[PDB]
């Protein structure tokens, strides 16, 4: 699901410039179990690739 | 006691400090990925 987020809402979050809030949400979700540190890194890297494009 | 090298003078925004605190609570002592995310 997290990956799907950056596959659909990554551009919208980047335009809104809420990438830090998205990372904070990922951290909270990981603290609530589900996802993982590797998942957080993968999602952030996918988000970064959107900005570079 | 160790790491006698003086720290580089780089300033941190309040958002940077708070998010560093959160990421330290998450990743603990893995400063590499913590810095990569910041």
Q: How far apart are CA A23 and CA B18, in angstroms?
A: 13
Q: Are B27 and B34 in contact (CB under 8 A)?
A: yes
- The approach used to solve this structure was cryo-EM
Q: Does B19 touch chain A (CB under 8 A)?
A: yes
Diameter over CA atoms, chain B? 29
Name every chain A residue with its beta carbon within 8 A of the beta carbon of B26: 27, 30-31, 37
CB contact under 8 A, B26 and A24: no
Burial B10-34 (b: 16+ CB within 10 A, else e): eeeeeeeeebbebbeebbeeeeebb
Q: Are B18 and B26 in contact (CB under 8 A)?
A: no
Sign of CA dihedral A31, A10, A7, A46: negative
Count other C-beta atoms under 10 Å from residue A24's C-beta: 16
Name every chain B residue with its beta carbon within 8 A of the beta carbon of A33: none
Measuring CA to CA, how many Å separate A10 from each of A32, A39, B16? 22, 15, 21
Closest to B38 measured CA to CA, from A10, A23, A25: A23
């Amino acid at each position: 699901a997290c990956m799907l987020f950056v596959e659909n809402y990554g551009q919208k979050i980047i335009k809104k410039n809420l990438c830090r809030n998205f990372m904070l949400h990922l951290v909270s979700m990981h603290d609530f179990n589900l996802i993982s540190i590797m998942s957080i890194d993968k999602a952030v890297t996918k988000l970064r690739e959107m900005q570079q494009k | 006691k160790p790491n006698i090298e003086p720290p580089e003078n780089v300033e941190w925004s309040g958002a940077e400090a708070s998010m560093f605190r959160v990421l330290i609570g998450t990743y603990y002592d893995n400063f590499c990925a913590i810095a990569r995310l910041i």
